[PDB]
Design a protein around this ligand. Structure first.
Ligand SMILES: *P(=O)(O)OCC(C)(C)[C@@H](O)C(=O)NCCC(=O)NCCS
Length: 83
């Protein structure tokens, strides 16, 4: 009808989080590359895993985190509604 509500996106919330864990001179994460392509070491993948646990109530293995991109990880987190 005349009223509408757009809502927030999980891909943005994980994107701006992962942009805080890239160890290279990169200023932001590229969505078409993996966390292993950004070169994120196990310590920072475990810090990302803990932040995702606190923010979404979800936990994922380092073997998935290294092989996955930002949209692929966001699709696993977005598998149930929270709003
Ligand atoms: P990364 O997985 O290369 O780990 C580097 C480390 C400095 C944290 C090192 O102490 C280590 O090998 N820890 C064990 C990491 C682990 O068990 N990961 C889960 C399987 S990918």
């Amino acid at each position: 009808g005349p009223g509408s509500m757009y809502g927030e996106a999980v891909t943005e919330q994980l994107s701006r989080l992962v942009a805080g864990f890239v160890p290279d001179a990169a200023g932001s994460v590229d969505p078409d590359r993996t966390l292993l392509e950004h070169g994120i070491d196990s310590i920072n993948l475990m810090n990302l895993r803990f932040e995702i646990t606190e923010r979404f109530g979800r936990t994922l293995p380092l073997q998935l985190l290294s092989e996955s991109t930002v949209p692929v990880l966001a699709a696993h987190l977005s598998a149930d509604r929270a709003h």
